[PDB]
């Protein structure tokens, strides 16, 4: 709950992977997180019943319901939807205040993915976003899709959001001098905490390069090591790294920087309900889509952290009071697009949920739309992007929905032709950078989605061998036949050979256009992938 009694020196109110999610919505946690053994049963790993588990969660609990799958529609409906800026921004202001009526002192720290993928964001190219940030007041942010906006636009929205940015890591890439500060120090009390930042380092292969021309984003040990140093050297007590790196990266950092006391992990959209230890540092993740506000408050010490508390406080805009700034600022910025916005494209039947290492409900209903418009199309590559929406049975499919899912600013849908070696080994690829059981590499990740294929994994396989028993359409994979493919999201195309005659265009018109038709969807859960191994799980898609 919200009612929490005072704890520390300081408090961190920290979110982050919102993706310009507006209002009230449904998120669910995936139904599996696959892991080769060495790293499973670890926080970035944890799905359905484990996670429980493993952070003592009750079932049924509102905790239980942001946490896991387990029960999800039976709780949606119990407690409500999540998120919202309106109901985020009611939290913060409560709990902020709460902390300096107490004397204490609060910082709100935004872990980055915050101005992109959303309706809003889209319709603004992410300046609704700031707006709501100068709102609630943010002090700090960092990023990662942020930069698909462009370089340009980002600096004109740097000029327009009042937090400080911060980042150790981009650097200009002929000089390397970075640009931004890499840390930023504040007094608590008697006590100086220094908020370091580091965006996420595999921006130029992860979007169009010519968003990032001209920028480094490289991970560099020696330089956020320097920074650490640095922030003690003018006078930091404890260090937080504000981080868009992913929890599995941050965890590793955790065993080869020294002085990084408590990391806010964003990028993997994980739950911490108790935070994670790893060397001599505390680990909390960020969530993601508005769903909680972590709050940690913190007993400093003269060289760091003696103690702190953790709460994940769920984001619920049936059970928080109304920040009315928030709700008017919306109401002007989209009056002028709600018919567009919220008027039903079609009802589904059952649940659509996007998370997950390998099939989703989503997926499958745009594979499936994808399949409607272009019969010739054999194979759809959808992006397994962590950010998204669930859609509850019964509920109307909307626009904001459609670029809650597949607002990103290059949404082009490729038609192009592969051979059947080339879709194995795109698969074999995802699952060698995905699955290795190198604790040393090892970050995690989700794998593309392929509707018209069929497939056996075997996470724990040498790499070449995790992906076999490939089939298309019921037969065979043939190596040397080539097949149509359809993708949107990524780069897939780039090694394809282009359909004649068709011209990309938004995979959120295709989708429009097929719901429009169909009026009502019903994609029942259908996994095209045996896991070897491991029990592949499934959420209840009914009630
Ligand atoms: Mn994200
Ligand atoms: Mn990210």
Do not use: C
Not at 259 to 284: E, N, Q, Y
Not at 398 to 405: F, I, N, S, V
Request: net charge negative; charged share 20%; hydrophobic share 40%.
């Amino acid at each position: 709950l919200y009612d929490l009694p005072p704890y520390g020196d300081a408090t961190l109110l920290y979110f982050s992977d919102l993706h310009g999610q507006a209002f009230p919505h449904y998120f669910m946690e995936p139904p599996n997180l696959i892991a080769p053994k060495p790293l499973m049963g670890r926080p970035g790993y944890l799905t359905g019943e484990a996670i429980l588990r493993y952070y003592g969660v009750e079932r049924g609990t509102p905790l239980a319901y942001l946490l896991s799958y387990v029960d999800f529609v039976e709780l949606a409906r119990t407690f409500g939807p999540i998120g919202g800026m309106g109901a985020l921004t009611a939290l913060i202001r409560d709990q902020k205040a709460r902390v300096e009526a107490e004397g204490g002192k609060a910082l709100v720290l935004d872990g980055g993915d915050t101005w992109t993928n959303s309706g809003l964001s889209l319709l603004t190219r992410g300046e609704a976003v700031v707006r709501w940030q100068n709102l609630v007041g943010v002090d700090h942010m960092v990023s990662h899709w942020e930069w698909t906006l462009g370089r340009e636009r980002v600096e004109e929205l740097l000029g327009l959001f009042r937090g400080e940015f911060l980042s150790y890591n981009i650097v200009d890439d002929l000089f390397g001098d970075p640009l931004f500060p890499a840390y930023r120090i504040h007094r608590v009390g008697p006590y100086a905490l220094a908020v370091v930042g580091a965006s996420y380092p595999y921006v130029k292969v992860s979007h169009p390069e010519s968003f990032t021309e001209g920028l480094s984003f490289a991970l560099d040990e020696r330089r956020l090591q320097e920074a650490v140093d640095k922030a003690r050297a003018e006078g930091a007590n404890a260090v937080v790294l504000l981080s868009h790196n992913g929890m599995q990266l941050d965890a590793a950092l955790a065993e080869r920087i020294r002085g990084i006391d408590l990391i806010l992990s964003g990028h993997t959209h994980d739950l911490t309900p108790r935070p994670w230890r790893v060397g001599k540092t505390w680990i909390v993740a960020g969530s993601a889509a508005g769903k909680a506000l972590m709050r940690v408050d913190l007993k400093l010490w003269k060289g760091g952290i003696a103690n702190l508390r953790v709460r994940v406080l769920p984001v619920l805009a049936e059970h928080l009071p109304k920040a009315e700034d928030v709700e008017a600022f919306l109401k002007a910025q989209l009056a002028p697009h709600q018919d567009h916005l919220f008027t039903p494209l079609a009802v589904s039947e059952t649940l659509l949920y996007k998370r997950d290492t390998l099939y989703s409900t989503w997926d499958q209903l745009v594979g499936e739309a994808v399949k409607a418009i272009y019969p010739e199309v054999e194979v759809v590559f959808s992006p397994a992007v962590r950010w998204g929406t669930t859609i509850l049975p019964g509920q109307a499919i909307t626009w904001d929905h459609l670029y809650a899912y597949t607002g990103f600013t290059y949404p082009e849908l490729y038609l192009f032709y592969l051979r059947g070696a080339q879709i194995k080994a795109v698969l074999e690829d995802i699952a060698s950078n995905v699955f290795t059981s190198d604790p040393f590499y090892q970050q995690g990740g989700d794998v593309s989605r392929v509707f018209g294929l069929r497939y056996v994994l075997d996470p724990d396989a040498p790499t070449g061998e995790r992906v076999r028993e490939v089939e298309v359409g019921g037969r065979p994979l043939d190596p040397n036949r080539r097949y149509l493919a359809a993708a949107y999201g990524g780069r897939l195309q780039r090694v394809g050979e282009a359909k004649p005659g068709y011209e990309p265009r938004p995979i959120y018109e295709v989708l429009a256009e097929y719901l429009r038709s169909v009026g009502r969807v019903r994609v029942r859960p259908e996994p095209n992938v045996k896991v070897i191994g491991r029990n592949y799980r499934l959420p209840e898609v009914t009630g």
